[PDB]
Design an enzyme around this catalytic site. Structure first.
Site, mmCIF file in Angstrom:
data_model
loop_
_atom_site.group_PDB
_atom_site.id
_atom_site.type_symbol
_atom_site.label_atom_id
_atom_site.label_comp_id
_atom_site.label_asym_id
_atom_site.label_seq_id
_atom_site.Cartn_x
_atom_site.Cartn_y
_atom_site.Cartn_z
ATOM 1 N N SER B 173 -5.667 3.613 3.904
ATOM 2 C CA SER B 173 -4.277 3.434 3.479
ATOM 3 C C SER B 173 -3.326 3.709 4.663
ATOM 4 O O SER B 173 -3.461 4.729 5.375
ATOM 5 C CB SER B 173 -3.939 4.368 2.310
ATOM 6 O OG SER B 173 -2.611 4.145 1.846
ATOM 7 N N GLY B 174 -2.363 2.802 4.856
ATOM 8 C CA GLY B 174 -1.437 2.936 5.960
ATOM 9 C C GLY B 174 -2.037 2.382 7.249
ATOM 10 O O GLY B 174 -1.501 2.591 8.342
ATOM 11 N N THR B 178 -1.518 -4.712 4.662
ATOM 12 C CA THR B 178 -0.527 -5.473 3.925
ATOM 13 C C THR B 178 0.367 -6.290 4.872
ATOM 14 O O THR B 178 0.597 -7.489 4.662
ATOM 15 C CB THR B 178 0.325 -4.537 3.059
ATOM 16 O OG1 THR B 178 -0.546 -3.736 2.254
ATOM 17 C CG2 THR B 178 1.246 -5.348 2.159
ATOM 18 N N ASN B 220 1.213 6.378 2.799
ATOM 19 C CA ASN B 220 2.112 5.273 3.099
ATOM 20 C C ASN B 220 3.404 5.343 2.314
ATOM 21 O O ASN B 220 3.413 5.783 1.177
ATOM 22 C CB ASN B 220 1.420 3.946 2.826
ATOM 23 C CG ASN B 220 1.865 2.858 3.776
ATOM 24 O OD1 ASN B 220 1.575 1.685 3.559
ATOM 25 N ND2 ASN B 220 2.567 3.241 4.845
ATOM 26 N N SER B 223 2.846 1.865 -0.172
ATOM 27 C CA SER B 223 1.449 1.588 -0.461
ATOM 28 C C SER B 223 1.160 0.685 -1.641
ATOM 29 O O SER B 223 1.449 1.035 -2.781
ATOM 30 C CB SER B 223 0.712 2.889 -0.695
ATOM 31 O OG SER B 223 -0.488 2.620 -1.378
ATOM 32 N N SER B 224 0.553 -0.465 -1.380
ATOM 33 C CA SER B 224 0.224 -1.367 -2.471
ATOM 34 C C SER B 224 -0.886 -0.709 -3.283
ATOM 35 O O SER B 224 -1.952 -0.437 -2.759
ATOM 36 C CB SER B 224 -0.201 -2.740 -1.924
ATOM 37 O OG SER B 224 -1.053 -2.623 -0.807
ATOM 38 N N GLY B 446 -10.297 0.102 1.370
ATOM 39 C CA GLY B 446 -11.607 0.038 1.989
ATOM 40 C C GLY B 446 -12.473 1.130 1.423
ATOM 41 O O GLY B 446 -12.048 1.835 0.522
ATOM 42 N N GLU B 448 -13.836 4.559 0.906
ATOM 43 C CA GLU B 448 -13.300 5.876 1.232
ATOM 44 C C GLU B 448 -13.956 7.061 0.525
ATOM 45 O O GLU B 448 -14.199 7.057 -0.683
ATOM 46 C CB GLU B 448 -11.802 5.916 0.974
ATOM 47 C CG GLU B 448 -11.005 6.328 2.194
ATOM 48 C CD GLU B 448 -9.520 6.414 1.900
ATOM 49 O OE1 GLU B 448 -8.926 5.384 1.481
ATOM 50 O OE2 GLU B 448 -8.951 7.515 2.085
HETATM 51 N N1 LIG Z 1 1.673 -4.801 12.505
HETATM 52 C C1 LIG Z 1 2.581 -3.745 12.284
HETATM 53 N N2 LIG Z 1 3.823 -3.668 12.935
HETATM 54 C C2 LIG Z 1 4.704 -2.614 12.673
HETATM 55 N N3 LIG Z 1 4.393 -1.618 11.750
HETATM 56 C C3 LIG Z 1 3.188 -1.665 11.056
HETATM 57 C C4 LIG Z 1 2.250 -2.755 11.316
HETATM 58 N N4 LIG Z 1 1.144 -2.570 10.561
HETATM 59 C C5 LIG Z 1 1.298 -1.507 9.852
HETATM 60 N N5 LIG Z 1 2.514 -0.863 10.114
HETATM 61 C C6 LIG Z 1 2.965 0.423 9.421
HETATM 62 O O1 LIG Z 1 2.041 0.769 8.259
HETATM 63 C C7 LIG Z 1 2.804 0.713 6.971
HETATM 64 C C8 LIG Z 1 2.284 -0.397 6.000
HETATM 65 O O2 LIG Z 1 0.901 -0.138 5.737
HETATM 66 P P1 LIG Z 1 0.153 -1.161 4.642
HETATM 67 O O3 LIG Z 1 0.975 -0.725 3.433
HETATM 68 O O4 LIG Z 1 0.668 -2.400 5.657
HETATM 69 O O5 LIG Z 1 -1.067 -0.151 5.072
HETATM 70 P P2 LIG Z 1 -2.271 -0.514 4.081
HETATM 71 O O6 LIG Z 1 -2.344 -2.040 4.004
HETATM 72 O O7 LIG Z 1 -3.647 0.241 4.572
HETATM 73 O O8 LIG Z 1 -1.941 0.338 2.600
HETATM 74 C C9 LIG Z 1 4.359 0.510 7.310
HETATM 75 O O9 LIG Z 1 5.194 1.638 6.835
HETATM 76 C C10 LIG Z 1 4.433 0.328 8.885
HETATM 77 O O10 LIG Z 1 5.293 1.311 9.526
HETATM 78 MG MG LIG Z 2 -1.454 -1.538 1.305
#
Ligand SMILES: Nc1ncnc2c1ncn2[C@@H]1O[C@H](COP(=O)(O)OP(=O)(O)O)[C@@H](O)[C@H]1O
Ligand SMILES: [Mg+2]
Ligand SMILES: [Ca+2]
Ligand SMILES: [Mg+2]
Lengths: 155, 800, 141
Positions: B173-174, B178, B220, B223-224, B446, B448
């Site tokens: 996560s994070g 996404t 996050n 977080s989706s 993924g 975890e």
């Molecule tokens: N390619 C990127 N460019 C800038 N910031 C990003 C990028 N990828 C991820 N982040 C950071 O990660 C967070 C989004 O994480 P997602 O929700 O995209 O993580 P995950 O898909 O594992 O839950 C945002 O708050 C952002 O600051």
């Molecule tokens: Mg996500």
């Protein structure tokens, strides 16, 4: 490994002449062991000479003729490079593959890699052999490699 | 020479100016470190299985067994673009090269089929229209690692090959999966745009989805909380034609519960923002988030979240999508009502056994918005009406109970709503237009492991398990067709191996999930009833199923049995699993909403022609059929630290991900064959100096001669029709062998020169001896003579 | 040796004031005087004694040639020196020749060394071997 009279006799003359060039007294300096065997036709490396007794600098140890045989013989069993061994090595520094190499590279290879040659040792051999740098600044290593293996007095 | 290549390729020449410390493959290596995962080091001495080293950094000394030491890569391999080319391909070498490129701005690195993406935590000039122009139609190898390249190649592959593509994206996560997904979509829109529009509408779908789909967690800030599979349909000229979305495992428990410093879904804090006061009444809410118990439990704000602007934007979102005011509002209504349900209070008699409400303002506002009768509602919510065969009875509610049916109502309502929402969006995006091929984009959590793991963890892990087996299977075909294609061949199995047993334990007839399913339709089922059969049918019979072990990390929570997934033994606790699978919901309350007046509500509670684990297992097999019918592409997302700081790297963290990521797993997999390969042409140029006295002076010939010449072990290699195949680590040896041999040959030529010098001088030395001989002889005479009382006097008789 | 031997006859006769055809204690004893500090007993016998018996010229010669016997010519000795001046500059570097003489071949000792360079013609660090050769032979001083 074990010599015939012929061989033993030549070593004597050579050992003789060297013993003289550092005080006649039946002893030769451990530092000239390399240079003595070289005059007999072998091509030892500095690590070889250090492994049988040789020293780093003059005045540290002298060896009677009776301590040479052991040394000389041991030195006859090392590895002597061959025409192929050398060509392939130079080939690695040759990009194009048309048997060339920058004069600077040559000089680099000779004093930078392996047990380095002194800069004076290098410019001496280039004269004797006559390594003629082509217009652009490079040379034909094939020649230099034969000449060096051919010897000063060329048959 | 461009700025478009600032954060894409480092310097070939400047990296060549990494001319400080040299490299001895014999002395430099990696070593286990608590702080940095590993530690560069120099070997000093050895005593069997006791290697002593010194750390380049603090120049100290430590002891490590010879088996824990890992191979180090020479300098020419720094910031490598495809880690599949590294001489030594290991844990410490993958960690290092990634950390390497990262601390240098580059966030994209290859590793086989994998495209690793590390969160920069800072916007970068990489995704501009100028950049895109450069990646267009360029193979992966002829340009700096870039996500744009994964997508583009999926495209050129779609046209040309005439086949379905799929791009899987995973990680913790994070990690940033996404936001990468968005980028893969934005790239197509900009390369296959027909010439508001669909492209747009697909962008607008995220806002609404993120409104009910995402939440603020400690990991996050967006977080989706659901898994999403998006398929983009294209027409016969390779232009975007349509799209659709699929979702998986929405986290329902959050709807009514928040953990400290965590929020419920954004939507709640938007309708509570008061950005559109005119709606406050149609929903019946007061612009205060900290007022309602279902969302005022954790924290209320987010730094980078303007709950007011965002509500505004989502409102706009539904218009571009084509939502009617009626629909849109229905949404806000059914959403708002969940806030009031949590505000409904109930009075427990003094010392007895039945309950009764305490007010109605809440129960009424609910029934209003729900389009039902509040009396009806509180009557069925209080003492229900079941459906027993031929004669439905009257059930009595205690206290608690009631409370548990209110939350269960919310949860169940939010889910139904959300599902409706997705299906609606699909409705929009489905332009009834001919589609020939598609490209999907997966994005789920993924694999975890945690301190404490439960039913929710099993699900996730059980998906990736199936999803990893899919990768090993792609790898296996590719490798087969490669070995066969070069005349060598293949001797053996399939990588979907030990994956099956683990998967079977879970999804097959008498396995875990199956028993949970069977053990639920029994009223008097205990957490131990469940533990009882799942010990009966499996412990002592399965290898992939065992008993709890010695705690791996600190704080290892409780557990009932261990599961041997492909990423390690994960400790699970089946406590409450019977409650987390079946959803208790007033069969009576449902019928009342079934007959509700508001179109939405009514549609949300109708009938057809059921349970969780059962749901997911069905949507999974669907997903897989689909993926098994495309050419995959993988992106592995990795989060660098638990502080959102750019450039900061945490070894234990990255290493951990790599372990469950699939990159380490895809290395061990590839190890089984012959990994490193070279084309005869290079082999000869590189290793001729390893057996020169055997070379005539072909290409495969010379090579066969060098190999047979070095008495190479048969297994160690194989001979293709264009390149030569080697086991892992072989070429590393041929590499040291080549260092000593170039070294001595040179030394040897130097030795030939030294001899030539002394042999030439030899004649001068001979002559110069007679000459110094002379001088010494003579000077000694004149030193004698001039003292011989005779001579000194003899020359005194010639002065005549 | 040509004018060499010839000369001996000339020296031989002076080497004898009595003409008794031999050099006795007196003949040497009474010429020398005709010059300076006629030696001390020890010297005269020491001298004459170098001869087993009476000085029959043949004995003069054999002893004198026996002493020089081992010497070389001027052009020779100066050619030997010329084997260390590859450039033909006609001079050697002082430290070079002082090392050649003291640590190689049949090493000179701190004495033979002092004696050799006391009157050595050495200007600006350059040892003129050509002169030095004239100095040792006698062609000069
Ligand atoms: N390619 C990127 N460019 C800038 N910031 C990003 C990028 N990828 C991820 N982040 C950071 O990660 C967070 C989004 O994480 P997602 O929700 O995209 O993580 P995950 O898909 O594992 O839950 C945002 O708050 C952002 O600051
Ligand atoms: Mg996500
Ligand atoms: Ca000596
Ligand atoms: Mg007389």
């Amino acid at each position: 490994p074990k010599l015939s009279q012929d061989e033993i006799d030549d070593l004597k003359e050579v050992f003789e002449l060297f013993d003289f060039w550092d005080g006649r007294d039946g002893a030769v300096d451990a530092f000239k062991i390399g240079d003595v065997c070289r005059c007999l036709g072998i091509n030892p490396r500095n690590e070889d000479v250090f492994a049988v007794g040789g020293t780093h600098k003059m005045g540290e140890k002298s060896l009677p003729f009776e301590e040479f045989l052991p040394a000389y013989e041991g030195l006859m069993d090392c590895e002597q490079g061959t025409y192929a061994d050398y060509m392939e090595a130079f080939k690695t520094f040759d990009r194009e593959g048309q048997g060339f190499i920058s004069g600077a590279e040559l000089r680099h290879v000779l004093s930078g890699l392996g047990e380095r040659l002194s800069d004076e040792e290098v410019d001496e051999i280039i004269n004797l052999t006559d390594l003629q740098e082509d217009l652009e600044g490079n040379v034909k290593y094939e020649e230099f490699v034969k000449k060096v293996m051919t010897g000063p007095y060329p048959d | 020479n461009d700025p478009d290549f600032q954060y894409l390729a480092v310097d070939r020449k400047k990296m060549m100016k990494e001319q400080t410390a040299p490299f001895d493959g014999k002395k430099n290596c990696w070593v286990p470190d608590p702080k940095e995962g590993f530690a560069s080091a120099e070997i000093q001495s050895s005593k069997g299985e006791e290697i002593t080293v010194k750390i380049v950094s603090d120049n100290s000394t430590r002891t490590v067994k010879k088996d824990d030491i890992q191979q180090m890569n020479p300098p020419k391999f720094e910031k490598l673009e495809d880690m599949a080319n590294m001489t030594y391909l290991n844990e410490a070498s993958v960690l290092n090269n990634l950390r390497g490129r990262y601390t240098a701005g580059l966030i994209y690195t290859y590793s086989g089929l994998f495209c690793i993406a590390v969160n920069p935590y800072r916007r970068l000039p990489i995704y501009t229209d100028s950049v895109i122009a450069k990646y267009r139609g360029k193979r992966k190898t002829e340009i700096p690692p870039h996500l744009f390249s994964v997508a583009d190649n999926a495209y050129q592959n779609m046209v040309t090959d005439r086949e379905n593509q799929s791009c899987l994206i995973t990680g913790e996560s994070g990690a940033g999966k996404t936001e990468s997904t968005k980028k893969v979509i934005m790239y197509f829109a900009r390369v296959a745009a027909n010439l508001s529009n669909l492209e747009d509408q697909i962008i607008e779908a995220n806002p609404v989805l993120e409104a009910f789909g995402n939440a603020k967690t400690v990991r996050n800030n967006n977080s989706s909380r659901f898994g999403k599979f998006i398929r983009i349909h294209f027409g016969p000229t390779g232009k975007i034609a349509g799209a659709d979305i699929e979702t998986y495992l929405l986290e329902k428990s959050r709807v009514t519960y928040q953990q400290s410093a965590e929020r419920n879904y954004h939507i709640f804090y938007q309708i509570c923002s008061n950005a559109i006061p005119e709606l406050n009444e149609v929903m019946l809410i007061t612009p205060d988030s900290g007022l309602y118990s279902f969302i005022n439990q954790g924290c209320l704000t987010v730094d980078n979240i303007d709950d007011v602007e965002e509500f505004k934007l989502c409102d706009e979102a539904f218009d571009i999508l084509g939502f009617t005011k009626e629909e849109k509002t229905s949404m806000f209504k059914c959403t708002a009502s969940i806030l009031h349900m949590g505000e409904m209070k109930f009075k427990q008699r003094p010392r007895e056994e039945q309950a009764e409400s305490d007010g109605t303002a809440e129960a009424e506002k609910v029934a209003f918005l729900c389009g039902i009768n509040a009396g009806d509602l509180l009557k069925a919510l209080l003492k229900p009406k079941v459906k027993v065969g031929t004669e439905m009875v009257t059930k009595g509610q205690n206290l608690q109970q009631v409370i548990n049916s209110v939350g269960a109502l919310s949860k169940s309502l939010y889910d139904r709503m959300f599902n409706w929402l997705v299906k609606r969006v699909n409705r929009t995006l489905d332009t009834k237009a001919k589609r020939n091929y598609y490209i999907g984009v997966l994005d789920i959590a993924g694999f975890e492991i945690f301190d404490f793991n439960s039913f929710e963890q099993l699900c996730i892990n059980y998906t990736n398990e199936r999803l990893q087996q899919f990768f090993n299977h792609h790898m296996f075909v590719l490798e087969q067709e490669e070995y066969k294609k070069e005349g060598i061949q293949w001797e053996f199995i399939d990588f979907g191996m030990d994956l099956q047993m683990c998967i079977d334990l879970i999804e097959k007839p008498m396995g875990i999930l199956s028993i949970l399913e069977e053990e639920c339709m029994f009223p008097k089922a205990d957490d131990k009833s469940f533990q009882d059969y799942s010990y009966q049918n499996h412990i002592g019979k399965n290898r992939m199923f065992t008993k709890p072990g010695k705690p791996t990390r600190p704080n290892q929570g409780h557990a009932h049995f261990e599961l041997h997934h492909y990423a390690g033994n994960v400790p699970y606790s089946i406590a409450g699993w019977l409650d987390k699978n079946k959803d208790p919901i007033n069969e009576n309350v449902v019928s009342l909403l079934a007959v509700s007046k508001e179109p939405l509500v009514a549609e949300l509670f109708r009938a057809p022609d059921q349970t969780i684990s059962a749901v997911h297992r069905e949507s999974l097999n669907k997903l897989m059929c689909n993926l098994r019918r495309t050419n995959p592409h993988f992106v592995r997302c990795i989060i660098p630290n638990l502080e959102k700081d750019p450039g900061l790297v945490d070894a234990e963290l990255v290493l951990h991900q790599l372990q469950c990521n699939g990159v380490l797993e895809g290395i061990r997999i590839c190890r089984k064959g012959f990994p490193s390969r070279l084309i005869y042409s290079e082999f000869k140029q590189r290793y001729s100096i390893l057996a020169p006295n055997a070379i005539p002076q072909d290409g495969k010939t010379v090579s066969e001669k060098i190999l047979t010449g070095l008495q190479m072990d048969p297994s160690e290699y194989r001979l293709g029709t264009t390149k030569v195949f080697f086991k892992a680590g072989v070429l590393g040896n041929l590499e040291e062998m080549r260092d000593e041999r170039l070294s001595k040959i040179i030394s040897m030529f130097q030795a030939h020169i030294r001899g030539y010098l002394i042999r030439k001088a030899y004649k001068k030395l001979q002559d110069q001896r007679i000459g110094l001989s002379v001088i010494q002889r003579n000077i000694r005479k004149w030193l004698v003579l001039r003292n011989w009382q005779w001579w000194k006097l003899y020359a005194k008789v010639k002065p005549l | 040796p040509q004018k060499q031997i010839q000369e001996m006859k000339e020296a031989f006769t002076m080497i004898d004031q009595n003409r008794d055809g031999f050099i006795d204690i007196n003949d040497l004893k009474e010429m020398f005087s005709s010059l300076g500090r006629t030696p001390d007993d020890k010297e005269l016998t020491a001298m004459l004694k170098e001869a087993p018996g009476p000085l029959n010229f043949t004995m003069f010669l054999s002893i004198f040639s026996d002493k020089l016997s081992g010497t070389d010519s001027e052009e020779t000795i100066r050619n030997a020196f010329g084997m260390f001046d590859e450039l033909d500059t006609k001079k050697l570097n002082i430290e070079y020749i002082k090392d050649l003489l003291e640590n190689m071949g049949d090493n000179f000792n701190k004495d033979e060394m002092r004696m050799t360079f006391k009157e050595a013609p050495v200007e600006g660090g350059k040892f003129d071997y050509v002169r030095f050769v004239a100095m040792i032979k006698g062609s000069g001083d």
